[PDB]
């Protein structure tokens, strides 16, 4: 998501 197609998680929170 966002500028790219990558989504990630940090401490259980999904972020772009």
């Amino acid at each position, epitope marked *: *998501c*966002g*500028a790219d197609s990558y*989504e990630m998680e940090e*401490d*259980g*929170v*999904r*972020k*772009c």
Partner: antibody
Amino acid sequence: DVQLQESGPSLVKPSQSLSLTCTVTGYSITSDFAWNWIRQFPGNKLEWMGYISYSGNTRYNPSLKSRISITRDTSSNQFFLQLNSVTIEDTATYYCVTAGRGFPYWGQGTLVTVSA
Amino acid sequence: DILMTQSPSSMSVSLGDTVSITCHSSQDINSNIGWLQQKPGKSFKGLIYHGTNLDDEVPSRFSGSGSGADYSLTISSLESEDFADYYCVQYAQFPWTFGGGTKLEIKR
């Protein structure tokens, strides 16, 4: 879904500690997500206070860091807010909240008045 | 801290209207924005995450778009339940911060 509920005192005296419990049902707090406290001030301004993760890692708002602790009891599936050295300015409605895919699940909120 | 500028502060609109609410951040937030609804009775609900994605059971009336520092929430064909306060939130940077809110009221 997840259901959350705040409990704790409605009135805290200045200089003392604000302590709130969030009881989580329908989902284990060790499974996923971050488990947050957010507050809303009398004029509708929202502030993020901090979270504890599913893995027990905590993040705090730098404005509160020295004054705050967020903890958990995994046996009771509860997490807790402690805010110390409180002033009248800490009067707000306190919410416990799940952050995962945004902020889907919110408790009903509980009003805490700080006054002498 | 990242400042979220939400517009407008208030709206007087009718049922069936399509309305847009905007949020500008003080820096690029890479779509890390949510939209929240608080109805009468003070209950909050997450509606949108990553600028556009719907949370569970949120009707398709609600949509989102934007990039960089400029985002929108659109509510098509307003229904009675949709009249509430709305808030943006960024989770791109700690501390997470919120817009000032938008109050949707019924024209009469």
